[PDB]
Design a protein around this ligand. Sequence first.
Ligand SMILES: C=C(CC(=O)O)C(=O)O
Ligand SMILES: C=C(CC(=O)O)C(=O)O
Ligand SMILES: C=C(CC(=O)O)C(=O)O
Ligand SMILES: C=C(CC(=O)O)C(=O)O
Ligand SMILES: [Mg+2]
Ligand SMILES: [Mg+2]
Ligand SMILES: [Mg+2]
Ligand SMILES: [Mg+2]
Ligand SMILES: [Mg+2]
Ligand SMILES: [Mg+2]
Ligand SMILES: [Mg+2]
Ligand SMILES: [Mg+2]
Lengths: 426, 424, 427, 425
Amino acid sequence: SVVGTPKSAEQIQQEWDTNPRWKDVTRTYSAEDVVALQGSVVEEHTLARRGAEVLWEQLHDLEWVNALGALTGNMAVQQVRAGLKAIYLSGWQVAGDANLSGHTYPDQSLYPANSVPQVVRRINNALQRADQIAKIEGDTSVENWLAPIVADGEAGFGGALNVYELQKALIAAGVAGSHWEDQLASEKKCGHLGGKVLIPTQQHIRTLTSARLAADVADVPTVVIARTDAEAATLITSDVDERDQPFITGERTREGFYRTKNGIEPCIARAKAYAPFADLIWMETGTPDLEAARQFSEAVKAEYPDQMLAYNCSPSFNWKKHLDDATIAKFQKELAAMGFKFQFITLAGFHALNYSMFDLAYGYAQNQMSAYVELQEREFAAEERGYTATKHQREVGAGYFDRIATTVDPNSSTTALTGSTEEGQF
Amino acid sequence: SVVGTPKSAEQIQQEWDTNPRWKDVTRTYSAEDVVALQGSVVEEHTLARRGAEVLWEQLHDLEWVNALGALTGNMAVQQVRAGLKAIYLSGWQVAGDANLSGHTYPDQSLYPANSVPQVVRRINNALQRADQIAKIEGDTSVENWLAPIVADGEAGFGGALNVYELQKALIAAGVAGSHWEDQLASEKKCGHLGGKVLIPTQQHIRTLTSARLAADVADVPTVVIARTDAEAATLITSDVDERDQPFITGERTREGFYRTKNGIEPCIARAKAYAPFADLIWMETGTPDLEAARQFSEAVKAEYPDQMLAYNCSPSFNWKKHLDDATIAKFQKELAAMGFKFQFITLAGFHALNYSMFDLAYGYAQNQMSAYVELQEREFAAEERGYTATKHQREVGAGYFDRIATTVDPNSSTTALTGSTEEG
Amino acid sequence: MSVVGTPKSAEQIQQEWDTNPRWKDVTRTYSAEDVVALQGSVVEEHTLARRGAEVLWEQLHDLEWVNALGALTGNMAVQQVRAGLKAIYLSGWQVAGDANLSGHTYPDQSLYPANSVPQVVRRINNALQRADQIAKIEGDTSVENWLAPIVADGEAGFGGALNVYELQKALIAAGVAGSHWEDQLASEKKCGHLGGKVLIPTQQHIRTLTSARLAADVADVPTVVIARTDAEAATLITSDVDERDQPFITGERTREGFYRTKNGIEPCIARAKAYAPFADLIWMETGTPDLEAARQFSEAVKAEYPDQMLAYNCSPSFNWKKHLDDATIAKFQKELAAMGFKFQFITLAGFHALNYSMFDLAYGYAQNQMSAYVELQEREFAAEERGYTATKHQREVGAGYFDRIATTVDPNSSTTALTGSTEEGQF
Amino acid sequence: SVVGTPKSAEQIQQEWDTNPRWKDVTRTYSAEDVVALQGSVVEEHTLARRGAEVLWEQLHDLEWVNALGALTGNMAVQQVRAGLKAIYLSGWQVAGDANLSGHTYPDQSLYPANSVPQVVRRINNALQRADQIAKIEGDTSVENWLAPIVADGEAGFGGALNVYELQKALIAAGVAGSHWEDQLASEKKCGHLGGKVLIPTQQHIRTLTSARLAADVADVPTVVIARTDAEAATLITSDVDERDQPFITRTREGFYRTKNGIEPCIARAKAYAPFADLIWMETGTPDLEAARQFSEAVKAEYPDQMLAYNCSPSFNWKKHLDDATIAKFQKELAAMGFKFQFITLAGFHALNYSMFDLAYGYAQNQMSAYVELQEREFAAEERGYTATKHQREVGAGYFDRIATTVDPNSSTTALTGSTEEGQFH
Ligand SMILES: C=C(CC(=O)O)C(=O)O
Ligand SMILES: C=C(CC(=O)O)C(=O)O
Ligand SMILES: C=C(CC(=O)O)C(=O)O
Ligand SMILES: C=C(CC(=O)O)C(=O)O
Ligand SMILES: [Mg+2]
Ligand SMILES: [Mg+2]
Ligand SMILES: [Mg+2]
Ligand SMILES: [Mg+2]
Ligand SMILES: [Mg+2]
Ligand SMILES: [Mg+2]
Ligand SMILES: [Mg+2]
Ligand SMILES: [Mg+2]
């Protein structure tokens, strides 16, 4: 069999040399090194390839790509139904409510390292079902159900090999892009939690190199995003890297960590060091501030004019405490003009899920069915805007599985939608 | 070690004979049969025991117990924060958005049989975290974070042994109660989908016997709920049971199923047959109708006066198409007076999750951050009603893990909440 | 937009069905248009399922026969291929007993979660991929194909036609080459050599085989579909509705409503003929390892379907030397191959190898401590003569492969694994 | 409900003060700190409690406790059937053939952190099934099917909170004991691989403190084992700890070079002793004299301190030792106070060799090779082997008893009419 035969080093090198995808991309390893790791067969990763290709085209074609954190398949389906063109998969939300330990965790890399890959696979499965249903329903209102997924690689759950395996698993699950931050994995934090410990600049370049190598061995053009936590972090594991030494105070903690001077200066320095290894760069920041965003963007683009940036529109900010309604309304449009081409609300799904169930349950506790009927009536009203989930049986594929059943046995007595209350009452 | 030493058959029999929990409960097997299956060690199932005890007390103490379908841990936490005293775990919602295949499924027993147990364990873990956080915060506003979970056993994913293993896994995960329906597992449907096939009355008694046996071997007083699908089902696998023969038309399908006359009559007959084996009885119905509910309740209670009933307030009903606002407002209160002591909205979580994300995403697609700020402002406003999740770091246990970190090393340089944007 | 994973047209699918000799003897009661209607906008490529199915089909026509042993761990499959076997058998019995997603030990009654065999297919493929990766960096060309095709157990499909469909789809996603499907009631499913088996009607099993083929067609891979009949020993059937089953119905029913049926080779031959248009291979479970009974089955099926390939379970559930002499045991698989049994497998080989080897080691260790372990280590050193490599356990699980990843990322790494290892020093 | 009501700080303190289990145990946190973390309900962990209690009793009653690495449930069942009194659960074997990624890995903490807990739960489930079957068969030949499990915590998969969560998950799964090593989690290695990086002495005390705290919050007396990798490791993350500074002698990564050998192992063992129920030093060769030097040095300061010894398959045994020394090896270690002795990778070698041997024979001679194995199994029945009868071994008789309890007249029970009933009795 010739199925999945690897490319030659010469073919890979020719693609690196000529495909404009790789115009601004440094690889410190060789094409021969990639082939050496591929064995005799390379599995095709259709959704990872398609998603990465679509995401790269969108980042260059659209004014910007925006996304909301999704922690369930149905969440991603509604994001795409509502007109969004990308899915954001938050590690924070996976820690809080969707990880393979079954526990609720704060955002400290506590959950099992295959948790985000499993949610990537789940979101792709949910979008595939919506795509399958749309086809049998003749629904062409959504152009692309398979929206690219950008997923959270955190600090890679250890060393370069832990990074490699997480990137490989995200690709197997069908990820389009992944982000990687310059924190110590054993002390990893939410960008907006305290107690952050940076790793040396060269160690994060190793992480970004490992993430690219896993994508190259998997033969897919995954979008690699570099995140820096240097705006708030006051600790670093080591002063070994001369690029980090300007910020080192000389003081050490009892753990052996070095105190370091935080702020935009070390973020700009790290962003420039990461740029040759990053398709997008993201700096975590303490406030939603267009002027601070402009300072970062202008400083990076002075050295790397074509470097695209990413911006976390964090729910960890109290928005109307900091900004007026006019500034809130223009916020993403203004960032887009500075080169922030991927913009995302990390914890949108956590807030939508927790608030909506609190609101319904509180009403139900007081007024029982009156509270539920208020929601059902809002759902009927949303059908005008394209909402379909009021008809919950077809939404989860009852019509699709009926079509499988009648394909196998046209005369089946046990199909689902005929005689359903959905057919009768909706 | 004497840890987990089994009870004697004599001790089990004495408990069956004297505990009022077992007043109305038929067991066709013996205490000796239970001990024979327990090996040398019986694992304690703390959350299954506590949950089952609390649920049984609530069903007798409260006017009624009501619940909403939860498909994530955080959903269950908000249900309890909002004042609900029980969690409903829908198999439909697990099929649609929370099962171990990773696929979206319609409600036809397509997902792996350990999926509902995993969500039971997840909900218990989430309620335990809320309980842990409440303790370190000195928050006494919720009396019982460990609300009892009633979970969906569907048709047991095969035979009596598949039923046994699902009940055992639900108990291991900390379930309080489980429901079991008289459908053929291979053709299982949502109560409000078509194409339902019943199994014989005696086969469902075998299912209910197996569910009780698994609870007895696990030494926990799990609430066992019998569901009948006979109101809409027009097929049955076999005419072997004389109790089913009055409804058999004599016609068979090409699959070998028997046509049967559906409606309230076979539901009442099956409910009476199931009553000695059921802590609660549930009949699926085509419309939310207080008079039809009364007919069912009065017919069952004529033979079994103390028999408690359960009612699915289904989102599969178009509520304002059938009922006026006054009838909707009194609906659960009126059912409670008829003996429907467990009432639940099966698909509440699916609708809350899908609608809230559609609404936010649509607004965000049009107006970006303005749409998110509308939600954040609703969250701030809900703090007056007891909503806490606006402070998302403490909500998922950042303060609890900080307390572990400072217990291990009081002088740690790397705790999370100090210097957080949440604090500042 | 991206053209990655664009589906084929119904016309292209139909042209393949009409002209590819793979489909020469294959009946599909649904249409090419029906397949495209179920594929949405994007078809995921299943590289290992495609390659495995292609290799298995070629092997079944090229080799005198394909033989396999039940594997329940990745390392088991790796050793089977290292030892020269060209296919992996994945037993549902072994998954029930020691490798299923419940974490429980079960008898073979479809008690475990339905995604358990797919997970083990993915595990075996991952293990063979690691052996393939290691062989490449070691310049080891002693094994031609590390990615041996996997034939996996679909049992009775864990419910209805839709449960069958989803199990086949998950087996394909995991990289299966072939899957087998039996005519038992899923709710009463048994090991072929346990009692209490309940058949389903002939037409219901054709529905199962149709569903298994449809899932492979929608996944766009030529999966090998194996039909198994349990009619040799089963004395119960769910229904007398199918006229093909009525000749064996006694008329008596159990209190469960099952019909008693006359078991033996006659209903197996009848069912095999009914299944043949829907089956790449046919397997009848049998009560004893008997070459003459195998010949009777083969000749009866091939009289109607001359090119129909057959499969044979060389079951550990047989007491072999109670039934056969050493000469008959030695020629057994060769003689079956000449009758058209082109896939032959020992279902529970892994269970017996694992359980016996650990009992033997643990018993010796309980008595004589390190002397018992050293006896095993010395047998491993001795087996290097036969091509065994796992004595060097660090390279066997990829320490050298991960060192190569580490030095690709950072040539100057201070923290690679094999340099300074006791394996480098002492082996 | 009063089910799972927590103990008071006063009750916990009274147990710490008076139970001889805690005689040699330092806790740097308080009883009040433990109660503060327990919420309103404490889940009972029956198998973790029973296993830890049995293991502690065995370590004081038996000349020594020995074990083999088990990576499947059936492996553990055969170890107990054969007369072993403890199960060892190797992280190396989980990396190689039993982890939740589905991948084959070298021993570098690459697999998901809940992998060893899942195998603990699996082994307990398998031993429970063997116990259930033994009861219905009236088989009293094994006194305790629920042998204590000692499991691998590696370097805790990150920080003190990752340690805490792994210990909690091992306890939930029913572990009796867990081991924890002084390596950097991001660079973790097999004891017998190169490229090991130590963490500071105080950082490992933090790990051991976190492992004890998780057991205290879970209210079970888990056996906590401290492992040092200082015999071979030539790197350490930091020179911050004055106890480590005597061995410090930097790399491009910022690691400090350190002088390896028995001296830093003895120093670390003494520092860990107040926080460790057993202490284990990885070593380069199986050497009774080096073991004696370590044991005598630790017991000089901590006379009752029990030790653990890895009888590693990573050693080429007959290259280093004669048959006489191999025969007495565990007995001699036991006399030095090595009360837990284990062959880490026994299961990997038994599984890989047995399938290679069978598959090679089958490739050459087909059914003749399988019949050789089946005949060895029949022959082993004299020594107590039961798995030749594979249907009863995996619980066909147990599930038949469930089926007939539910419906005595069931027509679909498994063993009646089976080939096992027909051909093996
Ligand atoms: C948790 C952060 C996001 C992150 O660090 O991924 C936030 O508060 O937005
Ligand atoms: C799906 C049903 C509930 C069920 O059958 O569990 C509904 O529509 O409410
Ligand atoms: C259990 C059978 C195999 C099977 O039915 O898969 C045997 O005994 O070989
Ligand atoms: C891999 C080691 C064991 C370990 O470090 O757990 C060995 O070689 O024995
Ligand atoms: Mg994150
Ligand atoms: Mg760049
Ligand atoms: Mg249901
Ligand atoms: Mg009753
Ligand atoms: Mg099988
Ligand atoms: Mg054919
Ligand atoms: Mg280890
Ligand atoms: Mg000590």
